[PDB]
Protein backbone atom coordinates (compact mmCIF):
# COMPACT_ATOMS: atom_id res chain seq x y z
CA UNK A 1 0.00 0.00 0.00
CA UNK A 2 0.97 3.62 0.78
CA UNK A 3 4.32 3.87 2.58
CA UNK A 4 4.46 6.20 5.63
CA UNK A 5 7.70 8.12 6.18
CA UNK A 6 7.60 9.81 9.57
CA UNK A 7 9.42 13.18 9.81
CA UNK A 8 11.06 15.12 12.57
CA UNK A 9 10.44 18.82 13.06
CA UNK A 10 13.21 21.11 14.21
CA UNK A 11 12.01 24.57 15.32
CA UNK A 12 9.30 24.69 12.59
CA UNK A 13 12.24 25.39 10.18
CA UNK A 14 13.71 21.95 9.17
CA UNK A 15 11.67 18.81 8.47
CA UNK A 16 13.52 15.59 7.73
CA UNK A 17 13.29 11.84 7.81
CA UNK A 18 15.50 8.75 7.53
CA UNK A 19 16.29 6.93 4.32
CA UNK A 20 18.79 4.13 3.52
CA UNK A 21 21.29 4.00 0.67
CA UNK A 22 23.07 0.68 -0.06
CA UNK A 23 22.99 -2.98 0.79
CA UNK A 24 22.85 -3.28 3.71
CA UNK A 25 21.27 0.21 4.16
CA UNK A 26 23.43 3.12 5.36
CA UNK A 27 21.01 5.56 7.02
CA UNK A 28 20.87 9.33 6.32
CA UNK A 29 18.51 12.11 7.28
CA UNK A 30 17.12 14.07 4.34
CA UNK A 31 14.79 16.91 3.51
CA UNK A 32 12.09 15.63 1.15
CA UNK A 33 12.22 18.71 -0.99
CA UNK A 34 9.39 19.50 -3.49
CA UNK A 35 11.58 22.44 -4.77
CA UNK A 36 14.40 20.34 -6.27
CA UNK A 37 14.88 16.99 -8.02
CA UNK A 38 18.21 15.48 -6.99
CA UNK A 39 19.13 13.13 -4.21
CA UNK A 40 22.49 13.58 -2.53
CA UNK A 41 24.22 12.72 0.71
CA UNK A 42 27.74 13.39 2.05
CA UNK A 43 30.52 11.08 0.82
CA UNK A 44 33.15 9.40 2.88
CA UNK A 45 35.48 10.90 0.25
CA UNK A 46 34.44 14.46 1.08
CA UNK A 47 37.31 16.99 1.17
CA UNK A 48 39.00 17.88 4.45
CA UNK A 49 37.84 21.51 3.79
CA UNK A 50 34.18 20.40 3.98
CA UNK A 51 33.43 21.12 7.67
CA UNK A 52 29.77 20.08 7.33
CA UNK A 53 31.00 16.54 6.38
CA UNK A 54 32.76 16.16 9.73
CA UNK A 55 29.49 16.06 11.70
CA UNK A 56 27.07 14.38 9.22
CA UNK A 57 26.63 10.81 8.00
CA UNK A 58 28.87 9.73 5.14
CA UNK A 59 28.08 7.21 2.37
CA UNK A 60 30.79 4.57 1.95
CA UNK A 61 30.36 2.79 -1.41
CA UNK A 62 32.87 0.10 -0.36
CA UNK A 63 30.36 -1.27 2.15
CA UNK A 64 27.48 -1.64 -0.33
CA UNK A 65 27.01 -4.76 -2.43
CA UNK A 66 24.48 -2.92 -4.68
CA UNK A 67 26.66 0.11 -5.45
CA UNK A 68 27.45 0.77 -9.08
CA UNK A 69 29.97 3.48 -9.93
CA UNK A 70 29.18 6.47 -12.15
CA UNK A 71 31.76 9.17 -11.23
CA UNK A 72 30.30 12.07 -13.26
CA UNK A 73 30.87 15.33 -11.45
CA UNK A 74 27.86 17.40 -10.29
CA UNK A 75 27.28 20.89 -8.93
CA UNK A 76 23.96 22.05 -7.42
CA UNK A 77 23.01 25.60 -6.43
CA UNK A 78 20.07 26.10 -4.09
CA UNK A 79 18.75 29.39 -2.69
CA UNK A 80 20.28 28.46 0.66
CA UNK A 81 23.60 27.05 -0.52
CA UNK A 82 25.78 25.13 -2.94
CA UNK A 83 27.63 21.85 -3.13
CA UNK A 84 29.46 19.57 -5.53
CA UNK A 85 30.73 16.05 -5.83
CA UNK A 86 30.24 13.00 -7.99
CA UNK A 87 27.38 10.68 -9.00
CA UNK A 88 26.88 7.10 -7.91
CA UNK A 89 24.13 4.43 -8.21
CA UNK A 90 22.58 2.34 -5.45
CA UNK A 91 19.37 1.09 -3.87
CA UNK A 92 17.44 3.73 -1.86
CA UNK A 93 15.28 2.48 1.04
CA UNK A 94 12.40 4.60 2.45
CA UNK A 95 12.31 4.46 5.40
CA UNK A 96 15.88 3.32 6.21
CA UNK A 97 14.60 0.29 8.13
CA UNK A 98 10.95 -0.93 7.69
Amino acid sequence: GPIPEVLKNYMDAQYYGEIGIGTPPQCFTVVFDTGSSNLWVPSIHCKLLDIACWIHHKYNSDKSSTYVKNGTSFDIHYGSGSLSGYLSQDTVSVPCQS
Binding site: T34, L39, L83
Partner: protein, 241 residues
Protein backbone atom coordinates in the same frame (compact mmCIF):
# COMPACT_ATOMS: atom_id res chain seq x y z
CA UNK B 1 8.88 0.23 3.37
CA UNK B 2 10.04 0.56 -0.25
CA UNK B 3 13.36 -0.14 -2.07
CA UNK B 4 13.95 1.93 -5.18
CA UNK B 5 16.62 0.08 -7.17
CA UNK B 6 19.19 1.63 -9.52
CA UNK B 7 18.88 5.14 -8.06
CA UNK B 8 21.49 7.64 -9.29
CA UNK B 9 22.49 10.16 -6.55
CA UNK B 10 25.16 12.64 -5.49
CA UNK B 11 28.07 11.81 -3.21
CA UNK B 12 28.82 15.31 -1.93
CA UNK B 13 32.52 16.18 -1.53
CA UNK B 14 32.44 20.02 -1.21
CA UNK B 15 29.91 22.20 0.62
CA UNK B 16 31.45 25.67 0.74
CA UNK B 17 29.70 28.29 2.84
CA UNK B 18 28.16 27.65 6.22
CA UNK B 19 24.55 26.67 5.75
CA UNK B 20 25.08 22.87 5.83
CA UNK B 21 27.30 22.78 8.93
CA UNK B 22 24.69 22.95 11.67
CA UNK B 23 21.74 21.71 9.60
CA UNK B 24 19.84 18.78 11.05
CA UNK B 25 19.76 16.84 7.80
CA UNK B 26 22.61 14.97 6.03
CA UNK B 27 21.22 15.49 2.54
CA UNK B 28 18.32 16.40 0.28
CA UNK B 29 15.89 14.19 -1.63
CA UNK B 30 14.30 16.23 -4.36
CA UNK B 31 10.68 15.47 -5.33
CA UNK B 32 10.03 18.02 -8.14
CA UNK B 33 9.93 17.25 -11.86
CA UNK B 34 12.85 15.83 -13.94
CA UNK B 35 13.00 19.13 -15.88
CA UNK B 36 15.02 20.72 -12.96
CA UNK B 37 17.22 17.76 -12.15
CA UNK B 38 20.91 18.65 -12.29
CA UNK B 39 22.70 16.40 -14.86
CA UNK B 40 19.23 15.11 -15.93
CA UNK B 41 19.37 12.47 -13.18
CA UNK B 42 16.05 10.56 -13.00
CA UNK B 43 14.54 11.48 -9.57
CA UNK B 44 13.73 9.05 -6.80
CA UNK B 45 10.00 9.37 -7.16
CA UNK B 46 10.15 8.97 -10.96
CA UNK B 47 12.25 5.84 -10.52
CA UNK B 48 9.67 4.69 -7.94
CA UNK B 49 6.76 5.17 -10.45
CA UNK B 50 8.72 3.38 -13.20
CA UNK B 51 9.31 0.40 -10.81
CA UNK B 52 5.56 0.43 -9.95
CA UNK B 53 6.26 0.40 -6.27
CA UNK B 54 3.06 2.32 -5.51
CA UNK B 55 -0.43 2.11 -7.04
CA UNK B 56 -1.17 5.86 -6.90
CA UNK B 57 1.57 8.12 -8.22
CA UNK B 58 0.97 10.79 -5.57
CA UNK B 59 2.62 11.73 -2.34
CA UNK B 60 1.52 13.83 0.60
CA UNK B 61 2.87 15.94 3.48
CA UNK B 62 1.64 16.64 6.95
CA UNK B 63 3.95 19.05 8.77
CA UNK B 64 3.35 19.83 12.46
CA UNK B 65 3.53 23.52 13.37
CA UNK B 66 4.07 23.01 17.11
CA UNK B 67 7.87 22.51 17.20
CA UNK B 68 7.70 20.03 20.14
CA UNK B 69 5.01 17.79 18.69
CA UNK B 70 5.45 14.08 17.96
CA UNK B 71 5.35 13.12 15.14
CA UNK B 72 7.02 16.15 13.55
CA UNK B 73 5.26 15.34 10.32
CA UNK B 74 4.65 12.59 7.79
CA UNK B 75 5.36 12.03 4.09
CA UNK B 76 2.98 9.38 2.65
CA UNK B 77 4.36 7.88 -0.54
CA UNK B 78 1.61 6.66 -2.84
CA UNK B 79 -1.38 7.90 -0.78
CA UNK B 80 -2.88 10.55 1.51
CA UNK B 81 -3.23 10.12 5.27
CA UNK B 82 -6.69 10.92 6.80
CA UNK B 83 -5.15 11.09 10.30
CA UNK B 84 -3.72 14.44 9.40
CA UNK B 85 -6.46 16.31 7.61
CA UNK B 86 -10.06 17.31 7.96
CA UNK B 87 -12.60 17.66 5.15
CA UNK B 88 -12.01 17.25 1.46
CA UNK B 89 -9.17 18.09 -0.81
CA UNK B 90 -9.28 20.96 -3.27
CA UNK B 91 -7.05 20.76 -6.33
CA UNK B 92 -5.08 23.13 -8.62
CA UNK B 93 -3.38 22.32 -11.86
CA UNK B 94 0.37 22.55 -12.15
CA UNK B 95 1.12 25.38 -14.64
CA UNK B 96 4.81 24.68 -15.43
CA UNK B 97 6.04 21.16 -14.76
CA UNK B 98 9.43 21.89 -13.26
CA UNK B 99 8.85 23.01 -9.75
CA UNK B 100 5.43 22.20 -8.37
CA UNK B 101 4.18 25.47 -9.76
CA UNK B 102 0.59 26.76 -9.49
CA UNK B 103 -1.39 29.94 -10.24
CA UNK B 104 -1.90 32.23 -7.24
CA UNK B 105 -4.96 34.51 -7.67
CA UNK B 106 -3.96 37.06 -4.95
CA UNK B 107 -2.64 37.67 -1.49
CA UNK B 108 -4.82 39.81 0.86
CA UNK B 109 -3.95 41.26 4.21
CA UNK B 110 -7.33 41.45 6.17
CA UNK B 111 -6.83 45.21 6.81
CA UNK B 112 -6.97 45.74 3.01
CA UNK B 113 -3.53 45.49 1.35
CA UNK B 114 -3.69 43.20 -1.70
CA UNK B 115 -0.55 41.77 -3.35
CA UNK B 116 -0.36 39.70 -6.51
CA UNK B 117 -3.49 41.81 -7.41
CA UNK B 118 -4.02 40.37 -10.92
CA UNK B 119 -2.70 36.88 -10.25
CA UNK B 120 0.82 35.51 -10.30
CA UNK B 121 2.81 32.21 -10.23
CA UNK B 122 3.82 30.31 -7.05
CA UNK B 123 5.61 27.09 -6.20
CA UNK B 124 4.65 24.67 -3.43
CA UNK B 125 7.99 23.97 -1.76
CA UNK B 126 8.37 21.76 1.32
CA UNK B 127 12.04 22.65 1.35
CA UNK B 128 11.43 26.34 2.04
CA UNK B 129 10.51 27.09 5.67
CA UNK B 130 8.92 30.54 5.05
CA UNK B 131 6.49 32.06 2.58
CA UNK B 132 8.47 33.96 -0.05
CA UNK B 133 7.38 36.83 -2.27
CA UNK B 134 8.93 39.62 -4.28
CA UNK B 135 11.01 42.07 -2.22
CA UNK B 136 8.87 45.13 -2.92
CA UNK B 137 5.49 43.44 -2.25
CA UNK B 138 6.77 41.75 0.92
CA UNK B 139 8.09 45.13 2.17
CA UNK B 140 4.55 46.57 1.86
CA UNK B 141 3.16 43.44 3.57
CA UNK B 142 5.51 43.76 6.49
CA UNK B 143 4.68 47.47 6.89
CA UNK B 144 0.95 46.63 7.02
CA UNK B 145 1.51 44.21 9.94
CA UNK B 146 4.16 46.26 11.82
CA UNK B 147 7.13 43.92 11.27
CA UNK B 148 10.67 45.36 10.94
CA UNK B 149 13.53 44.23 8.78
CA UNK B 150 16.17 41.87 10.09
CA UNK B 151 18.55 40.66 7.33
CA UNK B 152 18.40 38.88 3.90
CA UNK B 153 14.73 39.70 3.32
CA UNK B 154 13.60 38.50 6.78
CA UNK B 155 11.53 40.53 9.22
CA UNK B 156 10.71 40.28 12.94
CA UNK B 157 7.51 41.15 14.88
CA UNK B 158 7.35 41.97 18.57
CA UNK B 159 5.97 38.74 20.15
CA UNK B 160 3.45 40.65 22.26
CA UNK B 161 1.99 42.13 19.02
CA UNK B 162 1.32 38.79 17.26
CA UNK B 163 -2.11 37.96 18.66
CA UNK B 164 -3.52 41.24 17.32
CA UNK B 165 -2.16 41.08 13.77
CA UNK B 166 -4.41 40.82 10.79
CA UNK B 167 -5.06 37.49 9.04
CA UNK B 168 -3.52 36.98 5.59
CA UNK B 169 -5.43 34.99 2.99
CA UNK B 170 -3.99 33.50 -0.21
CA UNK B 171 -6.47 32.92 -3.04
CA UNK B 172 -5.88 29.70 -4.94
CA UNK B 173 -8.35 28.05 -7.41
CA UNK B 174 -10.82 30.76 -6.39
CA UNK B 175 -10.80 29.60 -2.72
CA UNK B 176 -9.39 31.57 0.21
CA UNK B 177 -6.65 29.94 2.32
CA UNK B 178 -6.51 31.92 5.55
CA UNK B 179 -3.41 32.18 7.70
CA UNK B 180 -3.81 33.46 11.21
CA UNK B 181 -0.89 35.39 12.75
CA UNK B 182 -0.07 32.30 14.77
CA UNK B 183 0.09 30.40 11.41
CA UNK B 184 2.32 32.99 9.67
CA UNK B 185 4.72 33.79 12.48
CA UNK B 186 7.34 31.52 14.05
CA UNK B 187 9.14 31.32 17.36
CA UNK B 188 12.92 31.51 17.02
CA UNK B 189 15.49 30.99 19.74
CA UNK B 190 19.21 31.61 20.15
CA UNK B 191 21.38 31.79 23.30
CA UNK B 192 18.42 31.78 25.71
CA UNK B 193 16.46 34.55 23.85
CA UNK B 194 13.07 34.00 22.14
CA UNK B 195 11.75 36.14 19.31
CA UNK B 196 8.95 36.11 16.69
CA UNK B 197 9.96 35.87 13.05
CA UNK B 198 7.56 37.01 10.29
CA UNK B 199 6.71 34.07 8.11
CA UNK B 200 7.07 36.03 4.88
CA UNK B 201 10.56 36.67 3.45
CA UNK B 202 11.35 39.04 0.57
CA UNK B 203 13.38 37.55 -2.31
CA UNK B 204 13.44 38.40 -6.01
CA UNK B 205 13.77 35.23 -8.18
CA UNK B 206 14.88 36.48 -11.60
CA UNK B 207 13.49 35.44 -15.01
CA UNK B 208 13.17 33.08 -16.70
CA UNK B 209 12.05 31.03 -13.63
CA UNK B 210 10.81 34.02 -11.70
CA UNK B 211 9.19 35.96 -10.42
CA UNK B 212 7.64 33.36 -8.11
CA UNK B 213 5.97 33.32 -4.73
CA UNK B 214 6.73 30.33 -2.54
CA UNK B 215 4.19 28.43 -0.46
CA UNK B 216 6.57 27.06 2.14
CA UNK B 217 6.21 25.13 5.42
CA UNK B 218 4.14 28.00 6.90
CA UNK B 219 1.45 27.18 4.32
CA UNK B 220 1.84 23.42 4.10
CA UNK B 221 1.71 23.19 7.88
CA UNK B 222 -1.78 24.70 7.93
CA UNK B 223 -2.90 22.91 4.71
CA UNK B 224 -2.03 19.27 4.25
CA UNK B 225 -0.67 19.00 0.70
CA UNK B 226 -1.00 16.33 -1.92
CA UNK B 227 1.43 16.21 -4.92
CA UNK B 228 -0.13 14.24 -7.80
CA UNK B 229 2.08 13.17 -10.72
CA UNK B 230 -0.78 11.12 -12.36
CA UNK B 231 -2.84 14.31 -12.89
CA UNK B 232 -0.18 17.04 -12.51
CA UNK B 233 -2.03 18.78 -9.75
CA UNK B 234 -1.62 19.92 -6.20
CA UNK B 235 -4.23 19.28 -3.50
CA UNK B 236 -4.84 21.11 -0.16
CA UNK B 237 -7.04 20.22 2.81
CA UNK B 238 -7.12 21.80 6.22
CA UNK B 239 -4.57 20.00 8.44
CA UNK B 240 -5.38 18.51 11.86
CA UNK B 241 -5.64 21.56 14.26
Amino acid sequence: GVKVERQVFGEATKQPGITFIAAKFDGILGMAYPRISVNNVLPVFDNLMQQKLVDQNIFSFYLSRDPDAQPGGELMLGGTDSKYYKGSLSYLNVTRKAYWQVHLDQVEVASGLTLCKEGCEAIVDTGTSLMVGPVDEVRELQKAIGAVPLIQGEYMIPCEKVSTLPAITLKLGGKGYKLSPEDYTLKVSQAGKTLCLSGFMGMDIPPPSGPLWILGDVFIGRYYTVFDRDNNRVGFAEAAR
